Amino acid sequence: HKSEVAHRFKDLGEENFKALVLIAFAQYLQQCPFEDHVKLVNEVTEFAKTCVADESAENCDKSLHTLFGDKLCTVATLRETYGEMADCCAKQEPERNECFLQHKDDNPNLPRLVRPEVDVMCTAFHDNEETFLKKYLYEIARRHPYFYAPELLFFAKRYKAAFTECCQAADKAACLLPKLDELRDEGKASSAKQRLKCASLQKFGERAFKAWAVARLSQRFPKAEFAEVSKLVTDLTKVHTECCHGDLLECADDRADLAKYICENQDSISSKLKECCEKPLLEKSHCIAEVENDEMPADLPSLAADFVESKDVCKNYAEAKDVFLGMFLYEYARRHPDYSVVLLLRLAKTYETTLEKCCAAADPHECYAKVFDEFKPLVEEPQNLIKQNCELFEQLGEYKFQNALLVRYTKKVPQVSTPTLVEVSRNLGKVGSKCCKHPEAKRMPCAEDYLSVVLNQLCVLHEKTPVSDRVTKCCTESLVNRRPCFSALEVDETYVPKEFNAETFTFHADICTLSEKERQIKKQTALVELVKHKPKATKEQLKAVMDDFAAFVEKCCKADDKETCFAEEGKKLVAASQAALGL
Template identity: 20%
Template sequence: MKFLCFILISISVGWAEDSGLRYEKEKVCEQLHGMGKQKFKGLFIAVYSQKFPNSTLEEVTCLADEMLKLGERCCVEGASADCYDKGATEISDKSCQADSPFPKHPGIIRCCAKQDVHERKMCLASLHYSAEELPSLLDPTNEEMCEQYTQDPIGYSFRYMYELARRHRSAPTGLVLNATGSQLRMLEKCCKPAPSAMCFFTERFQGRHFNIFLRFTSNVCHNNINLKSYKTGLTAYFGSLLKISFEKAQSMAKDFQDALSKCCLQPNQECIIQEFTEFQKGLCDESMLGTMSEEFQKCCGKAPMDTLTCIENLKRQPQTLPDIQPISQSLCQPDSPQETERYLFQIGARQLTTSVPVITTALNHVKDRVEACCSDSDIQTCMSQKDGDVKKIITLLSKADEKCTQYFKLGMPAFKVMVEAEVQGDGDQAAAKAETLVDLSSACCFQHSPAQRCQALTEKLISYDKGAAV
């Protein structure tokens, strides 16, 4: 969407005034007049729904209305030069009132305590929710959607945008806007004169590739933002998915994460599409294709965005890896800085079913212990003391991977009975461990597992004294 980046700059200025990033008022005003009030307001609803996913639609809409009024007031001939800055200050002041109608956040009190206006705006602008992910958005029936849309098209569009944006809070806003536009075009086409099941089927079928890409992008962006040591987990994942060496997997993980870090929080979708296109070229390079499976080669024959989602659906493959050795001083050699990452790769690349958030979280715990020992005055003694913890984490990760396979084979009722029976000998922790492991398997054995929830569940399992016994 042309000039979307400038509008998003204005949103930042609404609560933050960055002297290093001048607000290009003319271009934003041009876009306001070009989009019209409703679309411009919709953009703000999408952005603030992503920023504050736990807020109500009414709170988000109230803030969007204020931003629209600010634009209308300051994008007219004769508006004073400081119109926007003054208006932005008024909005930030209003957000600090006890009865503020704007989105709520635990950090607002801390920000509003700052006396310096500039610092307060910067603090408010940096606020983001870190709560666990929301469940997927489920559409009502075709008839219900048509009724809601025909009764109030604008209200429906804002509600849909709000619900979609808060569930894809880490993806580029442009993707959310495009998805909302597709939904509205489908309703406009398929609801008149009466709901048409065939029309809905056709439209959804034609839009399936974009919807898959949105979910894929939202997932990997969310992982990148929320998972510590995500590149380590990605390296292991690419190693098992593509059956490639540590060096190739690490290089691929770096390129992929660099693309995410550059583009996920960019408002325009063009950035992520361009970076993914370049990544696909390297992934499907002719020098590599000859060594890959037939299924992989078929994926590379698709359009760049479809290639990535296609490869994601491939089964991870077991490969021959060295036996995992006890942690030792050899992981701390200054002339071999990649030895720890190689060690973590050998652990993670063995996992064939559990999700990247689980693998990443477990590997990060191993990494923390190794790095702590490498900084210790007595490295080898520290390694010997921590090796038991590391073995428990490795065993837990292998068991989690095994449980994913069993979960898909047995189904929830039989799986739950099996897990409860397995942990009966774990004393007082048995019931809690069984519940956590069932929760982890039901939430974290899928491609697009929720990063924060799976991270929390994995850490909960690791926290048990006898984590290896699950």
């Protein structure tokens, strides 16, 4: 191209362009105010428009990296606000861009982003939609500088949709706040997913990843040949290693290039890519990424044939180990989209260990003949846990289910901070909600996607502030063994209970006027501190206090003098518990 700027602007459109440039600048220049970014974006946009007009005009032939970096280094407060980031401006590309990526603050020192009241948001949205949406895009972007800018642009659009629908509704808060809660929880899941994926690559390496991708891609495109899968596994690895390096343009290009190839070769991959591959560039890769599983081939044999009975089983494993175990994952995974990727890796790891031992032994077939008998319990364990948890989730509600997990987990690892025990337990209720409503097939995949995010975030938090050597064990295990380890954690016997604190169990009239979430988290917080104070307390003894307290609030939130009711009946109820259980 004569101008990289012009072509990108033309490709994206003025809106998407202005939006992405705003996210880009906000992720580097995290401490600068919104107005300063809008100034930069307007300047970079006018420059693009002049190049679109005259592609042979001044500076238009420069690389996007050079132009962005040059504009980054115009910023007056650069050395003032970041001392050794102004030292990046002394460097040529691509050392300068590398320098800029290495000076992004993973956690900036910015105040908690507060959600205004529904009426304030809806008025701001009505009165000035663009400023309200763009300021909050900037506020999120600067707090998550490694969040993939296009993905963040998609959330911004889904947020715009929620407001457009609900700010004209009869009951606005009832329409909007559930949607904003969902999008906040999907947004967090996305950032956590990006972190996990890249942390996993950096740690376990390209080989470990290739095993994951084979499994995943084989489930998604079962009608594709092992060759075509392997080819995509290779490309996707390049796409993944870049992106995880953190450059927006390289990552965007690589995802764009792969999406083009996938769409030009649909017939050799999948039939569900049709509509995805009619969508625009930015949406193309995202659509493909979130595309339905293709129907598995009608006529498929049993793996037993080529992976046990075949003459050349041990010959094939000898010739090329990784490729053969690669074929094993491919054949098993494509027959089982109902399986978690980690489950498939356990079967592959188990099959590997079997071939290692047996192909040495005198009669190989005799040895690994019953290899599938070892796969039965590995498959059955997660299938049981999911059904056992979805039964309980339905018998109770999400809330009462969260409370069940809360007691279960507090008793297992009570050294974890209350807010962590609460948020983890709450999040696993949300996993219960989403995944148990999916049909039996899509359940284990669903559970994996969210558990991976929940467990990794807990482990990240644990890395910072460690408490239990058993959480450190599960967190330092292989990703394949991480969930079963956590599942395996037993009730803590050695733990000495927490000292009683009067204020921890002191409740006020405010609890009556709090939103459902605010109320739930306060009650759940106390339920943890109760279990921490009395871990030997029986299932009967816990629901007794939980029922007694439920009657306490429901009575005292109907009283004419509510604050006095909570003071009076509160010290009464707490005292009755100190008798029922102990001080």
